[PDB]
Symmetry: D4
Subunit: 206 residues, 8 copies
């Protein structure tokens, strides 16, 4: 569609990515990055369109996407980037940075709730209703459905709007600096997950 | 004694602190920094001596100690600094930095155990036996005992040796960079505790 | 509307408050009184109308409201006042007293259920249906919605009726004196929460 | 012995009780006041002696002891009075008041520990070592042993000293008024236990 | 109605109770028999009608009902009689016997499910749909509603049919003798609850 | 019906079972094989039809079914065979082998979900909707309903299709050999359950 | 020794068993009666001697012992008979009755403790110290050690004394009738364990 | 010593390994095989001697040891081999087989205990006392102590004796065939741990 562009392996070029921030999510075969391969990278430049990239089994390279991940002048926006950063670094060898995580930002601003999921925060902060996929999905299937493409695009089409509102909320309640320090540490948090500390809060007493 | 110098309120001067790193621990009336006041700051320059500083109720200033806390050329070493950093910042208004935490370093190197306490790590890494205080102590008492001074000094007399060994272990097992990123975030972790997130892992999914 | 009067900062006068009891609830940015500021005070004189007062960030005074909180001849009615008392005392410096808590009264009379929420008790005791807000709300927003005003008013429009029924039930089942002693202690329970015992039952053995 | 006077049923007179405060503990057949009868009342006037009173099965009266329990000019000191107050009220029909509870006072002062037992607090605050009975005891036996008398006396011989130190600590750390309000509520807390709320914190949200 | 007869205090006579078994349930102010008084006794002779008896506060006698409870030639049927037996014995002084409990019988026959409630078993075994009361009810109210009378009658109108089917099932699967021994012990189980063992399985190892 | 053939005791012949694999499920009186007898064996040759066999109380033999269970050239397919294998071996004396378990295969392929039930996997992998029985069923009843026959047939009508898809998925993700080893062990896992280890993971450390 | 007589298979005669009560315990290969065979029966006539009987694998008969188990004029005393009754009935086909259980009696009298083990109760009630075996024992070994014989005898040498004291305590505290009803049900409790309800309190609500 | 031979990297030859079974244990930097490298392999031919082999960081080959691991005519004995098999396969690329696990064998024979550790089973089955290392050990240190060598040797010096006794016990209690099937599956259990199922019982229902 005009909203969703589908690609195999990689972005074909970076013509749509002359931007200062990109929105990213991924799909995998599960929550264990060492067992469960990367299957889809979905990315948006923030212009109301999304690119959905099917990643093949054994695929080691994605040079155009990786240029964006490495580019320190482009902020990579995620809603809970802790997992996606680990998956992307494990797949292609680059830990993306710098980052903004709308879930960490939500935890530091939406102090009146424990519901920090994407659907809930988009409804509350943006008045945008995104549908949540209910059945489980084999994201490694050779053929992805239009419904799958739409679900993947919905994960990234609104993160720039969400970041804009959350930045205002962080400033209003006085937590911009702490959020930024969390974003600076997040790539290390993801590295530590890959290294074997995924089940440990490294800052806990015991 | 020759090993332990006792002071009221503050260090009398910084003559013993022409160093690149200091070792710090604190004593309080309990684990709630907003309720339980700072009572003692114990600090060592790493030369086999320690200064034990009694902090009065309502004391807002400690200018010589605070110079060290602010000095970015001096690394502040703690064994679990997450609590002490919050207590010190709350008492005197300065978040100490930069820091090295031997407990975080232990968690990243001593992967074969869940025992990361000071007594255990000093025995294993330094062949130094420190006695652990068994009974509870009112650290806000007007008069501190020699036993209390000795317990407080034992917390700081060995942290430079511990840091030296842990740096070697971090290099051997390939985790120096991740440890350093943890140390850079730790002051923010302590700020977040004071701000109201003491019971939350900010990086957890939910 | 005729039922709901909206105000900034404070009641404009006490013309509507020549009464022996007032009904109060609050809205905040969350459940931590030290982190999460007071945002709204909703209050009713018991005449079927409510005042909804928007509290600004950093607001230290609300003299007309505070006159009511201090007035020992006016009983302050809450449904679970433990939290609101702490929030009000923290915001304006006065611990409201005396108080009547319809949730404590419910626990001492409705011995056949564990459901002591406002909606449930209003339905059972008053045959009044109040709608419960389902989505989370930023009560610190500059502009409050009519729906928010209606939710806040619903919290206080029925507490006088609820107190009247619960007083009858307390007398019927013989627990008036014990309830009154609970109400006398409740301001101290709220003070202890602010002081650092919010997670502790002070009367428990261990 | 000169330290311990043994009596059947009641104090023989109040000659030793021309005092402003008495220290009390009890022994029963267990922790359920409705099932497990009162067996012993131990009481001290604070002069370094104790009276140990054996209570018979079915005993409904103890007039000299009850005079002390009713006397509003005599403070009844307990270490955790919540249980003893319920047992005494159930046995003889009078809820003792006013009271001072050294365990509540410990919880409000000894903020650095979770160990609030009598042996621990006597060691820390008084430098007094009391032996703790290790084996279980049938306190309803017709014949009580000297060891049992000594254990019972040890529960009351030091509560006046403990109260004196805890009052100083409450003043030092600013919690005298809150402690006093807890002491005023404690008789109601015990009544509520007898009434059927022994397993419920009446002040909890849910 | 023709199905439901309402009475104050007691059955007016035993004309409808020339039977070998009666079906009984009760309503109280809650689950604590010592705190929560008996409010309603509902009873059926098994002929498709029910008597609903309102019990007053402080009522110590119900001679016609009690004749049935004492009559050893009449089996008292309950669905979970453990509670009702305790409540009835506490109210009127007679422990009813002999008994048949359809919930114990269900546990010994319906080995394929953990759902042993009255509504579920009536649907499965009898093809009878009974409506379950959803809101909480003050059964001590002076005036009981027709809905309350219908709920109470539904508890007893089908227990004879249920017992007939469960007896067949007990015989089919070979557990009649064990069920009967459970029924013989059940009055003691209820006595032990009143005596202070309500929270203990007396047959457990620890 | 043409889809479902009903039999008492055993298959009447093996005319429909000249196949290399059969699909099996069972119904019992519950989850304890020593207490809860086998009641129904449902089996399909994979041709879109099913045989539902009612097993009598005390039935020790089923020679035609048992020929299939013993035939090493016929793979017995189950969705979670651990229970059915134990039940069948206990009833007729033969541990069926070899086996394919679609639930183990699901756990080794559907790494993105914890929902491995038959209804969920048939929907996802086969686009087949099977209805799940909601009420509990006495499968030992003399007369089985058509609904019961349809539920039992639905358990086996699709396992050949499910196995075909799961074999493809096991090959795609590289786990065929591990799945096969699990299938070889499964009969022993079921034997160990019958022997007294039903609640123990024999491979766990402790 | 003079205190302990060892036998293979069975008592050689009943010359020592012309008594009204016997004390019994057993040893097995574990706590699962269906998996773990009976290995030893230890029995005392109450005269300060014990018989220790080694039971062979596959042994189905023990006629002299079984005469005692069946004899309704002989009370079988156990400390926690729930397990031994199941083991004995499973081994030889007779459920022993009538019984007295000193552990149930302890639970109904020693209301001040949760420690109802044999060693603890013998110390408290009898002033008898029995040594507890610390290492695990293969009770199915062909050759039993003298230490094993002494441990087994210690289980039965004191149960008559224990029963005598517990009967006095049951009378003193008014629970003789309830204890007797528990003893009458206990054989059924053991039957229900063998039947498949070992992990269920049959009298619980859910 | 004569009992313990130390080697770097690998066995120097297989002169001592002309045997049908070898006993193996390992030391690592922790319990995560992907993070925590293999540090020591200890192995015994069963002749009362042991070889302790220090494995270097990054060591990919150990050809003499690997010959033994691959040799299908040599049974590899472990006490809990699930972990060691994963570690060895991950280090050198060969999954050792066939295997005998004395911990699985203990679980299938020592049905009277939950203590299946090496020290406990050696004491009970062999009357051999092995000392357990109490402090934590950095097994990756360049220099291993004699105490470390002795601890490592103690893990393997007795496994042949243990296997001999456990084989007798498996035969006595009738579980040889089930144990053998467990041993055949164990290499797959270890593979599944490496593949990402270390925290899942693959045979559980859910």
């Amino acid at each position: 569609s005009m909203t969703i562009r589908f690609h195999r392996n990689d972005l074909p070029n970076l013509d749509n990515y002359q931007v200062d921030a990109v929105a990213i999510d991924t799909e995998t075969l599960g929550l264990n990055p060492h067992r469960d391969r990367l299957c889809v990278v979905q990315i948006s430049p923030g212009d109301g369109t999304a690119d959905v990239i099917q990643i093949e089994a054994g695929q080691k390279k994605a040079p155009n996407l990786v240029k964006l991940l490495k580019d320190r002048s482009i902020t990579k926006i995620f809603h809970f980037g802790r997992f996606d950063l680990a998956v992307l670094a494990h797949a292609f060898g680059t830990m993306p940075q710098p980052v903004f995580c709308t879930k960490i930002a939500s935890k530091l601003t939406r102090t009146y709730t424990d519901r920090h999921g994407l659907k809930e925060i988009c409804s509350e902060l943006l008045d945008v209703s995104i549908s949540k996929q209910q059945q489980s999905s084999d994201w490694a299937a050779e053929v992805l459905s239009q419904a799958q493409l739409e679900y993947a695009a919905s994960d990234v089409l609104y993160l720039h709007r969400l970041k804009a509102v959350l930045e205002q909320r962080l400033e209003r309640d006085g937590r911009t600096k702490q959020a930024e320090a969390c974003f600076k540490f997040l790539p290390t948090r993801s590295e530590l997950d890959l290294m074997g500390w995924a089940e440990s809060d490294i800052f806990a007493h015991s």
